[model samples]
Target chain A: GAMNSSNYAELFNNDIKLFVDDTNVYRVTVHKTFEGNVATKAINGCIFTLNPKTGHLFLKIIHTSVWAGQKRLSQLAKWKTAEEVSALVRSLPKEEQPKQIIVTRKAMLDPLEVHMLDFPNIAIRPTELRLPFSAAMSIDKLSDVVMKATEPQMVLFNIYDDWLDRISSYTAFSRLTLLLRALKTNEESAKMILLSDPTITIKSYHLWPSFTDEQWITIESQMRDLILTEYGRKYNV
Target chain B: MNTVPFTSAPIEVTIGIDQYSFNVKENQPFHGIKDIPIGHVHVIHFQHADNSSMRYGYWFDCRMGNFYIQYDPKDGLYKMMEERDGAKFENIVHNFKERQMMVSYPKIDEDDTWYNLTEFVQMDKIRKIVRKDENQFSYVDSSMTTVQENELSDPAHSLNYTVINFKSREAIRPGHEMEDFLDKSYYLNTVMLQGIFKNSSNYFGELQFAFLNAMFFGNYGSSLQWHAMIELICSSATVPKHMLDKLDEILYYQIKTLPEQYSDILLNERVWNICLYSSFQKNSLHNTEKIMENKYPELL
Candidate 1:
């Protein structure tokens, strides 16, 4: 089944919540016994802060299995419960913590929620894990919404499609050009545009193919020109 | 289960170095002879006394290259040579010993004043034997022959050789010979030196993982940490000041090549952690703590 907003809401409603305070800091809280799967138990979850100013990413893990008396578990699984996670958050030096926390998993969000109740000095919120504008967003719609929402200094496009089939579409390529033009303004921003593939193609889908190399180069060249033109920059991408 | 039948024979071998030739027997699957030293290059050629091709084999070492000699049924007598350039010979020998291959000769360049030209040319002639017996190997020999002939025709080039049908000798116990060169200090020093030459971001990132293991779980360690300890011992406490000096030279070379921000971390934090970890491993935690408190008070 396609994952919809209702599914996300139902899954997260009781487990976690996101609140943004006046300082633009996002506060998130997570409930215990939410989405505790085998893999989640193996590594528990992680908390990290990204300093937008310096582009420094400081990360600390909460290995949960250690508390569960599973000492034989791998070193990655040392923090298991919400209390332990909360302690980890409290231990971080105040200035090192970030105002924003992008919650991608329910397990991670649950711990954040518990931590926020104990220490309210740090503001936290859940970043939308879904595509920004739409669930099944076309590239054109994505670009249009992104331009209006924020002056995107950096844009990451994660394409999950069959390379041969995807590149054959002129509509898809046209949308990419629009998105690149909307986000990139000058040489400084042009280098920040990233295109990647989710690891799913190798692990789950088994659809890894080598058709993108030549095709992507051509597409990238076309999009680079569009980005430079939109940014009104005199340099090449 | 049916076992395929195979035959084996004891063969007589003679390895020649200029006017001196030593005899040995290749009765088993492997055989080796050493003590030719840095200056004497030797050649091994395999043949029956009647000169009939009875499973021919040949191997040679010029003290300056990785020389592999193997007999392939399809390819006849096969050999591969990777000549170590002047700058890379030490690195090559270091790798060779680490891999547990034979290491008998000391480092020698092509330009040592009393470097035996006759012995070197004799080794070259043995290398050319299989050149007449195979494809890729043959092409290399033919090209080399043309160059040698062209040089010799001028009568000014001093090095020339009369091709000899030298009996074959193989370094059978390569692993055993490598074991002899395995100094705990030398091995670690080379590993760390190689790491320094690697990109700073990669090396430091790797160092962080090691640091985290020690910081978190306690340095009861990994293969990487074990190797890092070796590097520390070699760099700090080992004798022969040149090894320590060489490591410093590589460290500076890597720092200059790295980006400005990374260079700072590589020098200050990464180098400090390596030295600290070494000291920690050498003494008790109490001593390490005191040293850390005194030297790196900020870290404490």
Candidate 2:
């Protein structure tokens, strides 16, 4: 079941209606990302939960952080302190004349905004949403440098250095590995072809010709062939 | 600048407050601009609509380099005294070190010059640096919430006398009467704010009036005059064009007809001053007057 990705491929394509009042309502997607040991519950980032049968709506935010260690520890401490304070206040009697000092610590993240089984669940429609690059890294920079360096040899060295820095800082596993593998496969080819030839280096702008232009047909075809045989086999599966 | 040194008779005075060792030199001009003494306090008086209670406050003007300390009316003196109270002379150096850390970055210096500072000021692009650190001074009894609206609607009202003087000095450039424009606008905002909040549920009314009283007593009367000009421009426009135009007309006629019907003499200049002092000036006295003038200028 875990290997069968197609089983859950189109499972999220469901329509959900969220009504604020009798007339005001908004639609949203509801799904959970369960890759590896990620959270199982559907994390609602901007879900205004309304009762399905009665339609009583309430707004809430689902917190998320792509961080770890000290930052996580600080957040936990703040939440714990907030929770304890709220509990003490709730325990007090309606009309108590007795004098008592009650200091309570409160947990910040205790009231986790979530739609439980008792809460109404509306089927949210799914659509292809393109999320931005989690961290700033681009392939366009490498391709640009390859085609537009005055001294191709020197520029190649700088490009390689920049690529190494980017890979080291990169936390995303799939994209980073793909780029690394591409760089490794092309390293020897780049040194032998680009460095030895001064013509390619002199006219860097002309090196990476327009994608649609006939001048780039040979190199573009070679790239496509290499990607088909090598990259296509590894990632296509 | 003409310097006619005036002398006052010296007398022995008893100060009730404890002398803090951290006290800097007395009677020194803040940033070599305004001659106001460091500890000198100016009093502004105001009244509520229902005539419930008359509020008064003594605002102190202090300076740290280019930064003119406009103390918040709520927490200004109270906070200062608490921080300074019983602070020993021995620990002054250590205290300064800690404060210096919090107030670090863009080190304040009298000689530090901004690029074409005069030009920037004339264009209303440059402003005097104030509030270097959290500890310099805060307005007493006034919350940041109260000051937020006053600062947002018209930024000039929130500044101190020293800042206004500094701006005025820089604004003395060719082909620009920024000082004159600023003076008019200052009184206009001061007069218009009261009328703006007469019925609005928003906190703009409380903030505008409170800030007006704070500045006047704070001896920022000259700067206060500048906001009055803003009120004048705002009230002159009409229906679906500018904010509160027709209402401004009604209020203007009310003031103009006060002399004819009620036999009260109409003095616009003194009325401007009265509105500034009245605390209700921020609501709509000047804006309404301008509306009447704009609608019926030929009658005059």
Candidate 3:
């Protein structure tokens, strides 16, 4: 019935390359008929290579198109049998073999299913497709993106009214904690400059009237400790 | 010095006429009397019995040893009356003292030196003793008549005397003569005294004119003049010892810290007299001038 670790192990043992999209769908190309057996979704693009021994496939999905639901969710089920999918995977070139798969525009199925590909070396990193100004992405993901980018000059937080209340209620402390943790590990000796209202800047977030002193203290203490530990010497904050 | 209670009773004595009693100390020494002449007048001092430090005394004539009488203002009159009436010396003394009193005198034989002594003659005798030596004294008659004549004599004299004598001297020879005279003299003196001239102009005239000009123009003219009067009075010994000491203190401070420039001003005696008159009357210079004007309205 449902795919498990054994099925993924059997499918990956043949040296096949795999790609997944936001719809939880994947594509394969046989090594023998890679040119003729090439497959493309209506809303996507892919890459295929053929050798005497095996074949390789790189499936790239158009992120916006897939997240907009233009493509069906069960496009991978069309392959029907394990025999057909296993044969296509067995043809992949060893050098062009997929050891990591990134799934974007997450929806439809569990991202962990793709992670259960059962190849110890293969990494499954789930990402999402959203506008730059959208709140769909969590602050934790934003922290990761910022940390992995080139060294930043200054980090500014343009929070609005009730920002502290929103942050506390939404459990955004975890995201803030992740950000500070990333800053602590930063190699470029970068500084995090927080910019908010005077009240928030001074960590007197309880003055906002919406949050109790107890609530504000808990969040503010953690924030102050994190900033002091990470940038206390560097930024002199 | 011989010490003796020379007076009859060495106690507070109320004289016949004087309002105050003379507090005489018992057995007080009459020091310096041994060498004094028989007719020499010496100041006798007595301290008040009520207050030993309070001293009051008068001049006394030395007669025969142990033969003395209190001299009175009437003694001078009685002596005059004696000459007119041909009264005896005993009667004169009794009449003068308002009591019968024993009178003694040094006996004179034909070989002994004899002299007729009348109150007027004795007064002259005392005066001669008291008079300052002619060689030792120099008279500076700054009387109004002398001052006026000097100021009007010549333009030079007018300038010199005007400043020395005061604004009144200026009035004596008023008009272009005195004004022009003063201007030229003032210019020459100030310039020369300031060391601009060498071996030029009369040194005395230059010094005198400069001094007078300073008195006329200096702001501290009155104070400078006051100090000079005090010094002259002290040097002449014209005032009592206590008063001299008091005046000395006044003069001491008045000139003590005087600006060197005011030294010339202090030489002007007219300003000194005006300041002295003001001080004695306890009036301001302006009030003193007003009073003087009222008293001598024509001269002023």
- Per-residue alpha-carbon lDDT of candidate 1 for residues A12-122, written as tens digits (9 for 90 to 100): 222222211111111123445646733322322223232222322222233332335444322222112233334545566765444444443333443344334545454
Runs of candidate 2 with Cα error greater than 4 angstroms are A1-237, B1-132, B136-223, B226-230, B234-242, B245-300
Interface DockQ of each model: 0.00, 0.00, 0.00
For residues B165-244, what per-residue lDDT tens digits would candidate 1 score against the true structure? Answer: 10101111122222212133333333333434233223333333232222222222322342353244433344345433
Ranking by lDDT: 1, 3, 2
Compared with the true structure, what per-residue lDDT tens digits does model 3 show for residues A171-194?
432333333343444423212323
| CAPRI rating of model 2 | incorrect
Encode model 2's per-residue lDDT on B1-300: one tens digit a residue. Answer: 100011111211111111100111223221111222333222112222232232232222233221222224353121222223323522542443444321212213562222111111211111221222333332322222222234333333343222122123222222223222323333223323343323221212222323333332222332233343323433222212233443344334333333232122222444344443343334454565465356433333
Measured by lDDT, the strongest candidate is 1
- Fnat by candidate, in order: 0.00, 0.00, 0.00
Candidate 1 global lDDT: 0.33
The sequence of per-residue lDDT tens digits that candidate 3 reaches over residues B47-85 is 334444323332334342232333234421101011223
The CA lDDT at B74 in model 1 is 66
